[PDB]
Amino acid sequence: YKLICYYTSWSQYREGDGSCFPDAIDPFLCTHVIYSFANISNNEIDTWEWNDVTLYDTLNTLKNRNPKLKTLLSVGGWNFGPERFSAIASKTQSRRTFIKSVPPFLRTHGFDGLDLAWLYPGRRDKRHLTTLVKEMKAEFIREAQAGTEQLLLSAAVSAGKIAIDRGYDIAQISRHLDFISLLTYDFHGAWRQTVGHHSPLFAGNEDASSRFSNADYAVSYMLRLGAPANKLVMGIPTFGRSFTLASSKTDVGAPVSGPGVPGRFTKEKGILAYYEICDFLHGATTHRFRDQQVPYATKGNQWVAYDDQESVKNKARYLKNRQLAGAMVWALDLDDFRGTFCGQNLTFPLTSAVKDVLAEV
Numbered sequence: 001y002k003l004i005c006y007y008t009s010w011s012q013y014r015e016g017d018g019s020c021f022p023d024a025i026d027p028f029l030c031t032h033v034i035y036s037f038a039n040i041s042n043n044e045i046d047t048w049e050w051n052d053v054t055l056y057d058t059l060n061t062l063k064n065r066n067p068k069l070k071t072l073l074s075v076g077g078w079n080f081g082p083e084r085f086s087a088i089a090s091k092t093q094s095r096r097t098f099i100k101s102v103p104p105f106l107r108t109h110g111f112d113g114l115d116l117a118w119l120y121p122g123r124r125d126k127r128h129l130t131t132l133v134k135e136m137k138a139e140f141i142r143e144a145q146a147g148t149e150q151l152l153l154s155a156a157v158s159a160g161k162i163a164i165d166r167g168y169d170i171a172q173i174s175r176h177l178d179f180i181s182l183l184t185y186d187f188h189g190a191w192r193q194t195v196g197h198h199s200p201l202f203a204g205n206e207d208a209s210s211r212f213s214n215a216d217y218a219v220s221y222m223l224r225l226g227a228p229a230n231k232l233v234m235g236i237p238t239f240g241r242s243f244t245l246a247s248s249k250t251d252v253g254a255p256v257s258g259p260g261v262p263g264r265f266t267k268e269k270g271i272l273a274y275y276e277i278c279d280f281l282h283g284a285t286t287h288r289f290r291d292q293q294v295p296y297a298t299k300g301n302q303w304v305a306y307d308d309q310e311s312v313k314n315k316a317r318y319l320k321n322r323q324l325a326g327a328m329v330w331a332l333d334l335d336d337f338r339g340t341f342c343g344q345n346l347t348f349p350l351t352s353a354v355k356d357v358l359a360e361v
């Protein structure tokens with residue numbers, strides 16, 4: 001079983017305890033750690049933060065303590081214009097330029113692979129995304145001839161039926177990718193006017209109409225489309241999405257006035273780190289959709305949909321039961337990495353809970 005963990009560049013700037021650097025990572029926690037995100041300049045891969053080469057170095061030293069640890073660099077991300085990916089993938093010339101620039105980059109900084117995070121390919125991109133993957137892999141293969149270990153190629157993919165149908169040729173890109181991370185966590189949220197969980201596991205006979213928004217559906221579908229189970233990794237979030245209630249109504253259906261107030265360390269409307277949620281829980285009412293098997297909390301006019309250890313071990317058992325390749329976690333820096341906010345003195349409670357289930361029968 002694989003455990004893919006994302007580490008984000010910008011978590012270094014969070015004030016106080018919120019600050020997270022590569023060395024705060026347990027080298028034996030995950031099997032693969034992915035650094036987010038790399039840029040693209042003059043159609044070539046390139047750094048993003050001013051100190052990436054240093055953090056790159058810090059991250060890859062973890063492999064000195066755990067030789068089995070594999071690390072990857074992710075390109076794209078959400079603050080990256082998908083139009084930009086588009087312009088690069090459709091011009092065979094600039095596509096080849098980008099592809100050629102990748103191996104030496106990874107090789108220099110010590111990464112074991114590249115992770116593509118194009119969010120998201122439209123209908124006019126499907127044909128090229130397949131091309132990019134095809135050719136990118138082809139290149140990694142030819143580069144393994146120099147006698148070094150072959151680089152890995154993975155991709156983060158949407159879990160929205162409509163999004164999948166629109167820009168992904170799953171049967172094709174699965175032959176070439178080493179593994180596929182299913183973004184099974186941004187199903188609600190997305191500026192809606194009602195309250196709802198972003199990463200529910202099951203549909204649950206309650207409130208149907210968007211019957212395709214849950215991990216179970218998204219998974220069964222990918223399988224039906226042609227992705228092999230031993231190549232799928234299911235995404236488990238470590239953050240919650242928040243909402244500012246517009247009434248004293250707290251149950252399913254309750255109206256929303258907008259996103260929730262910012263976390264004290266994450267400072268971003270709409271999301272809270274798990275550790276900020278651990279703090280948010282004191283004096284809040286806790287509930288759990290038994291249908292979808294995920295919790296939510298409320299306190300004042302704040303409503304929070306999140307994942308605790310129980311819902312996470314639950315998701316882990318699920319992917320095991322369907323014989324998936326493993327779990328993907330977004331992100332290490334949003335979990336309680338210091339392990340001083342959530343009670344039980346345990347570093348990385350969420351990610352660990354997942355690792356434990358994966359380590360069992």
Ligand SMILES: CC(=O)N[C@@H]1[C@@H](O)[C@H](O[C@H]2O[C@H](CO)[C@@H](O[C@@H]3O[C@H](CO)[C@@H](O[C@@H]4O[C@H](CO)[C@@H](O[C@@H]5O[C@H](CO)[C@@H](O)[C@H](O)[C@H]5NC(C)=O)[C@H](O)[C@H]4NC(C)=O)[C@H](O)[C@H]3NC(C)=O)[C@H](O)[C@H]2NC(C)=O)[C@@H](CO)O[C@H]1O
Pocket residue numbers: 009010013036037048049050076077078079080117156181183186239266267268271330331
């Ligand atoms: C599987 C997968 O692919 N992952 C998906 C994710 O992409 C999804 O969302 C996530 O992605 C976006 C980015 O794509 C991320 O956005 C980040 O937003 C924060 C603000 O909330 C940005 O924070 C600001 O970052 C800049 C630099 O990065 C900091 O600027 C620096 O400032 C200091 C002094 O303060 C200087 O010393 C530096 O020189 C300076 N300038 C720079 C740019 O170098 C700034 O301090 C910081 N502060 C502020 C104003 O808040 C951050 O940059 C954004 N990321 C990027 C790459 O730009 C978003 O937060 C994240 N979402 C979550 C909740 O994690 C993810 C969503 O769930 O799911 C997957 O699908």
Ligand SMILES: *[C@@H]1O[C@H](CO)[C@@H](O[C@H]2O[C@H](CO)[C@@H](O[C@H]3O[C@H](CO)[C@@H](O[C@H]4O[C@H](CO)[C@@H](O)[C@H](O)[C@@H]4O)[C@H](O)[C@@H]3O)[C@H](O)[C@H]2NC(C)=O)[C@H](O)[C@H]1NC(C)=O
Pocket residue numbers: 039040041042047048049
């Ligand atoms: C990620 O990679 C992006 C795409 O490669 C980077 O995009 C930016 O690149 C340029 C240069 O940084 C931005 O410059 C704009 O403003 C300057 C004035 O401040 C204008 O002058 C430039 O023009 C010439 C190029 O002919 C240079 O010789 C000169 O030195 C100067 O840079 C320039 O014309 C332009 O208007 C540009 O706006 C922007 N392009 C895009 C599409 O993003 C980006 O910087 C990278 N991001 C990070 C964080 O690394």
